[PDB]
Structure 1
Amino acid sequence: MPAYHSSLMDPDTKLIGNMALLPIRSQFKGPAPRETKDTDIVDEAIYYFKANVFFKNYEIKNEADRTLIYITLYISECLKKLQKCNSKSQGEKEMYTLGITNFPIPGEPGFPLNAIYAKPANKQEDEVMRAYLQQLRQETGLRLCEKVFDPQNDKPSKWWTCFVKRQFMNKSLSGPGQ
């Protein structure tokens, strides 16, 4: 039963909608503060990913689970692009252009979990979580791009691209409306 759940829900950390704005250790611009611990929510998602995709039931403990699950859904999407990439350089350039696309946000149609995320009501909610989710995407893609390419040849490695078919509880951040 117990899939992996987020460790880093500090009571100091602010919420938008139903997602926790955990600090990020990234050079990308964004509203969450700069993380300095070795572990990070994007690294929780990336560390758990291979195990986490096999579980088929997932019980939301808190807003951080609604945050970390979003990363894994996005990792299960970036793997689609970089498996086609001939080189790490191509993938890194590709991944930067992937994450900036306008993915749906909570309750905006085609978003896959309208039952479970409530839409931000106001501009200072909406714009800030867009500015948050964007920098999560930007960092998440780059951290895969550092480790999916085998350094001997920039082959996008068999062991990572094997997972492309295995969508996280059959949920796609692409969204089923397309």
Structure 2
Amino acid sequence: MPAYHSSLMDPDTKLIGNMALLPIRSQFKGPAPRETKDTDIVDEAIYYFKANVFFKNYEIKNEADRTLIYITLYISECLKKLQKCNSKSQGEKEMYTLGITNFPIPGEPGFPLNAIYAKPANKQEDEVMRAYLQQLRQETGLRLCEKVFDPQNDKPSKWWTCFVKRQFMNKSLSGPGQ
């Protein structure tokens, strides 16, 4: 029950799509605008991550949770790659190489939660989903690079690598297969 559900869904925020489109703070480009406060949905998924993955049950309390559960899965996919990185510099570029990969968009088959996400009905949502979900990934990767690699030796830090074995309710963004 008391898993950390998404905090940011102030009704004044635009709510495009089957998920909270949210103002991803980044120097990348996309449909979502720029948040100015110090807290943001990618920072929220990062912040709550270590707790969230232990909770074996999780409701959708509001539309922003169907965002947060996807950000969490991609964060796990970051660790599934950065753990191999030989140094932080590789940990950045070999993360960008992940962000621009053709992840199954929730309405596409092979996405793990097709029961929970409605299909995007038209190009002006589908193409928005392609341009939003990349903007999530492109940013989400660059934030983990700064804090998975502890600064003494550009080792991928052990404490983070512990979580490599753990998956949010045992769902995988590899889908039925990569």
Query: Do these two structures clear the TM 0.5 threshold for a shared fold by scoring above it?
Result: yes
The alpha-carbon deviation at position 177 of structure 1 amounts to: 4.5
Partner Cα distance (1:106, 1:38) in 2: 28
Contact 1:105 1:119 in 2 (8 A): no
Partner Cα distance (1:120, 1:107) in 2: 6
Contact 1:17 1:117 in 2 (8 A): no
Match of 1:137 in 2: 137
Deviation sequence 1:45-102 (CA, Å, 0-9, x none):
0000000000000010111000011100100111011000010001101000101101
- Structure 2: give runs of 5+ residues left out of the alignment: none
Match of 2:117 in 1: 117
The alpha-carbon deviation at position 15 of structure 1 amounts to: 2.8
- Structure 1: give runs of 5+ residues left out of the alignment: none
Is the partner of 1:130 in helix, strand or coil? helix
Deviation sequence 1:124-146 (CA, Å, 0-9, x none):
00001210110100110110010
The alpha-carbon deviation at position 2 of structure 1 amounts to: 1.4
The alpha-carbon deviation at position 14 of structure 1 amounts to: 2.6
Partner Cα distance (1:75, 1:116) in 2: 20
The alpha-carbon deviation at position 17 of structure 1 amounts to: 3.4
My pick for the range that moved more, 6-15 or 99-108, is 6-15
Calculate the TM-score normalised by the size of structure 2. 0.97
Moved over 4 A (4+): none
Calculate the TM-score normalised by the size of structure 1. 0.97
Q: Does residue 54 of structure 1 match 2:57? A: no
Partner Cα distance (2:150, 2:71) in 1: 22
Is the partner of 1:119 in helix, strand or coil? coil
Contact 1:24 1:41 in 2 (8 A): yes
Aligned length: 178
Partner Cα distance (2:159, 2:58) in 1: 24
Match of 1:161 in 2: 161
My pick for the range that moved more, 39-48 or 17-26, is 17-26
The alpha-carbon deviation at position 16 of structure 1 amounts to: 3.6
RMSD: 1.0
Partner Cα distance (2:165, 2:37) in 1: 32
Deviation sequence 1:8-30 (CA, Å, 0-9, x none):
00212233431111111111111
